[PDB]
C-alpha cells in the first residue's frame, strides 16, 4: 500500500498507470474480438477471445466490437475481460495490493455505477476505490480552479461550468455526438468519392486516416470555393495493400459536423452553441471568469485550427466588448489521467476512498451517496 492505480475507461481507448507518474504505462484501445471463421489447423487451440493490441494486429479475421458505446457499457463480459487483461497481463499488479480509481462521463445512469462498483468490490476485491468525473480531473491537470471544460471524447462530448471552490450541476450539457459519428460520416462520404469501407477493419483504417489527414476550416464556403480549384488541397494516403487514396474536401468536411450537427440529421446544436447556452445559464458575474478561462480536453479536439474557429465563433456570438481566450495545451489527450493521478496523490483524498467494510454492508447504493 504505497500508491494507487488510475484507470480511465475511455469510450474508444483505455488509459492506465501508477499514481505519481507523468505518463501512462498502458495505452491500448478497447477492443474485444472473437474469431469469425471456423479454423482448420490442429496445432493451435488459441485464445477463443482476443483483446488489446493483439486484436488490432490480427483484426482481419475477427469481428471487432467496442464494449462501450457512447459512454454507456453494453456488454459487461467484455468490460470485465478488458479489466482483467489490463490488471494482469499489462500492469501485472494484483488488485489487492493497491486501490483503483475510476472515471465516467456526467449524466450517466446509476445502474452502470452500481454494477461497476459491485463488480470491482466482489470480483477483484479491491481494498478501496472511487468514482470521479473526467472534467474535474482535467481542471486538476490544468492547475486551475475556474473555467469551462470541453471534454469531447470518442463517445461523448460534455461541458461542466465551474467556479472557485464549487460547481454548477444545473448547467451541464451532454452531447452524444463524438468521434464514432464522425468516422461513420467519413465512411459515408468516402463512399461518395468512390472508396468503399464497411467492416470494422476498414473502420480502424478510416479512423487512422482521419487521425492523420483531417483538419478544421475557418470558413466553410471559402474552403469549398478553393476546393473548386482543386490543385493544392488534395492529399494521398497509402493503404496497407499499397493502394493510394486521394482525399480532398473530406479533410475539412467531417470535422464541420461538430459545428453543424444537421449533416448527420441530429436536431441539436454545435459545440459553440451548447457552450454559449451553458455559460448563459450561469450567473452574470461568473460569466466573465468563464469567458476568460476555457479548458478543452479529449481526443476529438486535436484538429489544428479548432481553437481558432471556436474563438472566432464565441466572439461573434458573445458581445464584442471583452476578451475571449482559448487555452489549448499540447497534452490534452492524457489530461484526465494526469488529473486523476494528481488527485490520488493529494493527502486530503486518502480518506475519501470507499472501503470494503462499506460494501460488506449494503448493495452498492453507496456509490452515489458519497463518492461522487
Amino acid at each position: 500500500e504505497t500508491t494507487a492505480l488510475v484507470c480511465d475507461n475511455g469510450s474508444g481507448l483505455v488509459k492506465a498507470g501508477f499514481a505519481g507518474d507523468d505518463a501512462p504505462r498502458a495505452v491500448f484501445p478497447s477492443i474485444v474480438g472473437r474469431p469469425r471463421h471456423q479454423g482448420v489447423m490442429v496445432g493451435m487451440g488459441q485464445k477463443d477471445s482476443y483483446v488489446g493490441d493483439e486484436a488490432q494486429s490480427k483484426r482481419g479475421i475477427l469481428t471487432l466490437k467496442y464494449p462501450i458505446e457512447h459512454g454507456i457499457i453494453t456488454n459487461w463480459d467484455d468490460m470485465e475481460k478488458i479489466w482483467h487483461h489490463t490488471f494482469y497481463n499489462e500492469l501485472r499488479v494484483a488488485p489487492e495490493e493497491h486501490p483503483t480509481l475510476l472515471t465516467e462521463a456526467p449524466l450517466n445512469p446509476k445502474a452502470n455505477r452500481e454494477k461497476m462498483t459491485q463488480i470491482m468490490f466482489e470480483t477483484f476485491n479491491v481494498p478501496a476505490m472511487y468514482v470521479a468525473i473526467q472534467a474535474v480531473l482535467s481542471l486538476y491537470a490544468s492547475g486551475r480552479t475556474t473555467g469551462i471544460v470541453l471534454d469531447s471524447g470518442d463517445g461523448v462530448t460534455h461541458n461542466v461550468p465551474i467556479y472557485e471552490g464549487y460547481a454548477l450541476p444545473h448547467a451541464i450539457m451532454r452531447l452524444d455526438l463524438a468521434g464514432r459519428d464522425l468516422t461513420d460520416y467519413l465512411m459515408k462520404i468516402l463512399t461518395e468519392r468512390g472508396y468503399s469501407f464497411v467492416t470494422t477493419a476498414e473502420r480502424e483504417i478510416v479512423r487512422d486516416i482521419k487521425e492523420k489527414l483531417c483538419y478544421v476550416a475557418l470558413d466553410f464556403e471559402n474552403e469549398m470555393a478553393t476546393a473548386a480549384s482543386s490543385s493544392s488541397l488534395e492529399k494521398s494516403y497509402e493503404l496497407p495493400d499499397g493502394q493510394v487514396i486521394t482525399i480532398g474536401n473530406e479533410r475539412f468536411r467531417c470535422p464541420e459536423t461538430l459545428f453543424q450537427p444537421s449533416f448527420i440529421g441530429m436536431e441539436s446544436a454545435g459545440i459553440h452553441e451548447t457552450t454559449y447556452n451553458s455559460i448563459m445559464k450561469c450567473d452574470i458575474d461568473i460569466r466573465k471568469d468563464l469567458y476568460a478561462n476555457n479548458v478543452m480536453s479529449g481526443g476529438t479536439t486535436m484538429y489544428p485550427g479548432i481553437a481558432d474557429r471556436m474563438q472566432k465563433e464565441i466572439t461573434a456570438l458573445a458581445p464584442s466588448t471583452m476578451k475571449i481566450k482559448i487555452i489549448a495545451p499540447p497534452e490534452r489527450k492524457y489530461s484526465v489521467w494526469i488529473g486523476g493521478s494528481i488527485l490520488a496523490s493529494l493527502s486530503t483524498f486518502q480518506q475519501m476512498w470507499i472501503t470494503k467494510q462499506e460494501y460488506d454492508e449494503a448493495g452498492p447504493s453507496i456509490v452515489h451517496r458519497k463518492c461522487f
Binding site: 457512447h70 454507456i72 457499457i73
Partner: peptide, 7 residues
C-alpha cells in the same frame, strides 16, 4: 440507452 439512442 433503453429509450432514445441505442446503448
Amino acid at each position: 440507452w433503453x429509450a432514445x439512442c441505442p446503448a
